[model samples]
Each structure stands twice: as structure tokens, then as C-alpha cells.
Target: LPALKLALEYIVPCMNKHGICVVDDFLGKETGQQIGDEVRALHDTGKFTDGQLVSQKSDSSKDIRGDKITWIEGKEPGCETIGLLMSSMDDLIRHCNGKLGSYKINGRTKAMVACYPGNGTGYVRHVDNPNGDGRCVTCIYYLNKDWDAKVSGGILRIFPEGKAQFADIEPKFDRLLFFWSDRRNPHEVQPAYATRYAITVWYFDADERARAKVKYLTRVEL
Candidate 1:
């Protein structure tokens, strides 16, 4: 039940200081592999659609983001394993609300299951909540087993605020990454040679949600 004990102790402080944190084996390989298998099966069934860039509505959006994704609502079929991961994320959100006095994270966007097909596909650098549509924190769980940075590629390259050198994070199995979802963290997925899988959920701040004029809670197709 207490799956995020280390994350609870360190994530808030890391986010405050560095604006990013990576936790390996957060859900263990078995759970991650299960979710990966489920997602892969879904992808094979043609359930995923081309990923769209939020800021770009042009035809070139696909060039910037070359992944296929499917939204995961909590009650979706064949998503029981994903539900376990979301439960852990919920615990982390509660911990964040308690630790950070000002950030009132009341809700989260629906989780996204994404796959970058093994054809050197990648996403260009971008910030998640540049215009501030309530998203405060970004949580991503990688599901690529035996992923190698040199051979498999698909490293998450993060440019942290006030740092000259960027950070490269491998999309290893069961690795959970967290970061602030604003201009503080500009990041992108490096070109991947092998298939890459990741699921992401964004935490929303209550005040920001009220301030933003968006009607829908989940990400809108742009």
C-alpha cells in the first residue's frame, strides 16, 4: 500500500530545489511489464492515435511529436493494472498537498499511454503547462523493459531552470519521473530506435484550475 514512501520523503524537496526527480523501480518490474503488455496489446488493436502538439495545430504537429497515444480513464476495461499505478500517484498528490503549503492540487488529468514506434520517432522540446491550464506537476511512468540509452534511445532530455547542463533520463522499466509542469522544466523525448512506452498524468492546482477558462478537465485535442 505504501508504494511511494521514498517519493513522499524526497519528491517535494527535489521539486522545490531542482524541479525534477526520477525514481527507479517505483512500481517494480512485474507491474510495469503487465501495464506494458496491456498497452502494447491495445496499440496493436489500433486503439492509439497520433499524438498532437498542444501549441501547434498545423500539419507539422506530427513531425514534432511522433508517438501514438490512448487516454486512460479510471474505469476503462483492461486497465486494472494501470489503476494500481494511479492509486500510487494519488498518494503522492496527497503528500504533495500536505508538504507544499501553497500548491493546492485537487485533481489530475486522465493518464495517457503513449508509444513511440521503433522508427526513430521523438517529440520536440516543450513545456507541459506553458500557458498554465491548471497543471502544476508532471508525473510520467516509463514501461520500456531493457531500455538502453545508447542503443534504444528515447532518453528524456530535461533542461532544468538555472542549469547550464541538461539531464538525460533513461526510459527504463518501472521508472517514475516527476517534475514541475511549467516553464521551469523544458524537456523532450530523444529519438528512439526501439519501441518506447510511457504513461503520464498531470496534477492540477485548484486555484490555477479556477483561473483558467478551460471547460474540460482532460487534455483537449488541438
Candidate 2:
């Protein structure tokens, strides 16, 4: 928890002012590589669904996102890829909630392993909180190994609320990116030269059942 404690010093201030906080080396290199390898292993064995698009209906017109996804819901056993790292995340949420007044933390969080392959693969600009179901924060842990800004193009472009300028963040390994879900932080991913790997966790103030009515939930099937 030393890392979390140390990070909060800078993270809290950055988030409070900028509406987005980029925590460099949030996870150790070893942990990031392990998670990255596990995600790649699952993808190699066909454990993920490719070309997933989220929309209100099961139709194509509303399709927007394009990526391979492996969703993990409600504390499922044997989720080795994420289970080992979730405790710290829970602690982080509790800590932030106590400090930030407009926040309410819940254990009802979901994780996803997202892969955006090369050959013009990228997600368009969008906000994480689509529905009004009390989603408070969005956390993304980049697991892209050997990512080079010169070659790799999977940059997370964030448009922070109330700012005319924007920031382009490289999806570097072991880095954890944070943002308020409803802060008008419109963001997108540019096409990558190589596949980009990342783990995304969204924390909601509401419980699981309360989110059932979310028109376009991100929880895709395994």
C-alpha cells in the first residue's frame, strides 16, 4: 500500500484541479506484465469476444466501440488476472471517496480487459458514464508492453471539462489513468501500430441491481 499512499499525495491534488489524474507507474512492472500476459493468453486461446460494439439495442446502427473484451462481474472466483490487484483498487476508492465531497464509493465495480488490435483499430470519443446510474469514477490501467510513442498510436486523448485544451496520453505499461465519469471528459483512442492492452475499472455509487436499467452497460459476456 506504500505506492497507493505515495500516489495519493499527488493524485488527489491533480484530480481535484484537472479532473483527470495520470499516475505514472501505478503498478510495478512485474504486476503489469503478469496481467498483460494473462490477457494475451486468454485472447490467444479465444477466451474473448472480438469486434464488440455497445449500444442500447442489439442493432448495428448504434454501434460505436470496436475492441476485444473480457468482462468480469461481481467477485467471480478464479479471475486470476484481476483478482490479485483488486484489493488495492478497493482501498483507493474508499480513500478518494473520503476526500472528495461529490463522490460516493461502492463495492459494485466491474473490470474489463480490453484489446485494440492494429490495422486502424480505435475507439471513438466518448464518456464512460452513458447512463445516469451513479457511475462516479473511471480507472484505466495500461498494460501495453514495449509501447513506443514513435510507433504506437494508441493514445488516450482526454478532453477535460472546462478546458479548451486537451491531453494525449500514451497507453504506457504500468500506468494508471483516472478521471471523473461525468466530468465531460470526452476521450478517444487513436489507431495503433500494434495491439494495445489495458484493464478498465468503473466504480459506481449505485449497487449492481440498480444498474440493470443502464441502456448500454459495458459488461460484455465472457
Candidate 3:
């Protein structure tokens, strides 16, 4: 209920103050569980791809991120959970694009679902807006149920610009975070003691529409 009102009421102001903003209770418990269950099922069946940069795919180094990921597309066999999660965010996505002014995301594709297993599983600090990724904003929805700060080592560590001090945010259940993907901000995930699950959405600027399309097309052909 409250989350439905967030982007319309507080997103812009909060984002202006802090380059990133976290909204607790982003989705209800049942809804989050529905998606989480599906992720675990897919992961058990080895449906995710290795997390690596396009340029570094040949190398077997996960020094940056070791989590496995899968895209949440509009059409995917037996991926009903992904469809539910993606469809639910349509309103928020439009609101974000509307408020983002020039940096709007074209709804040509869907989001990504990631699974980071326990025992020091996470991502090192990195920027999302690479030259061809066409990412303008990075949105993450955490689905870790009953997360304990001490037990779960997966924390979204946000590095503030122009300051050495940083903020560590827990990946609690049903929590959503949004941040700009430009060079102004860089972030990473600490190692996880318990498995962590999240859905990450990247919005691209209007001008990057063609670029994003080509990137996806190449993947299908290859």
C-alpha cells in the first residue's frame, strides 16, 4: 500500500538528497515469497548464467561478482514467478521514468533475478552504467526472508560520493533500493553467510533505446 505511493510522493525528493534511496516494505511478504520460491527452484535446476562481465567471460574469475543470474522476461516457459514480479513493477517503472526527466527507461525488456549463495558470495564495488549496457538507474528488490545482520553477510554497501565513510544496508525481505547508475556512485555486496536473492532492474535513458535493443538481439542470435 505505502510502496504504491512511494515513487509518486517521495522518490524524487529522497533521491535528490541521496543519490540512492531504500524503501522498506517494497512488496508484501506473500508476494516476495512467491518470487523467492521460484528463484530457488530455478537455481536448483541450474537455470542461471554465470555472473561475469562480457569482456571477461572467457576468464573464470568471479573476483567481482559470483552470483548466478537469470533475466525476467515477458515470455519464458515455466517462469510464472518472474512474470508476476515484473508485471507488478510496471507502475513504479513508469513513475520512475516519468520523474527521471531525460534519463528515462524504455520498456523494451524486463528485469534480472540474481541468486548469491552463502559462504562468501557477493559482488565487489562496480558501476552499472558501462558504455553499452545503457543502464541509467539500478533498482534492486531484496527477497531474503528473516535476514539477520550477523548471519547474512550480504549487505548492500553504498559508497557516498566525496566521502570516505560508507553506509551498509541490510538486504531484508521485501526491501527495494534505487540508485543512479552513472559514475557518481559505485556500490558492492559483502560476502553472504546465508543465500541472498534479489531482482535487479536497470533503466536506460531514451537515447540508449537502440543500443539496448541491439545488445539483446545479439544475445538471441548467439
lDDT for every model?
0.83, 0.73, 0.74
Tens digit of per-residue lDDT, candidate 1, span 1-222: 354666567787777778788888787778888988888888888889865443455566345446888889756788888888888888877866756536888889898888888677788899999987889889999988888899988999999888999999999998999888999899998888998989999988889888784566556588
Cα lDDT tens digits, model 2, 75-158, are 554457466666666667666765643555665566777888665668888988765667767888888877986787888899
Q: State candidate 3's TM-score.
A: 0.80
The sequence of per-residue lDDT tens digits that candidate 3 reaches over residues 157-219 is: 888778698978899998888787877678888888788888887776767766666767734
Of 1 and 3, the candidate ranking higher by TM-score: 1
Query: Which run of 10 residues does model 3 get worst, by summed lDDT?
Result: 54-63
**How does model 2 score by TM-score?**
0.81
TM-score of each: 0.87, 0.81, 0.80
Show where candidate 1 strays beyond 4 Å: 50-65, 214-222
User: Clashes in candidate 1: how many?
Assistant: 0
Model 1 TM-score is 0.87
List, in order, the clash count of every candidate structure: 0, 0, 0
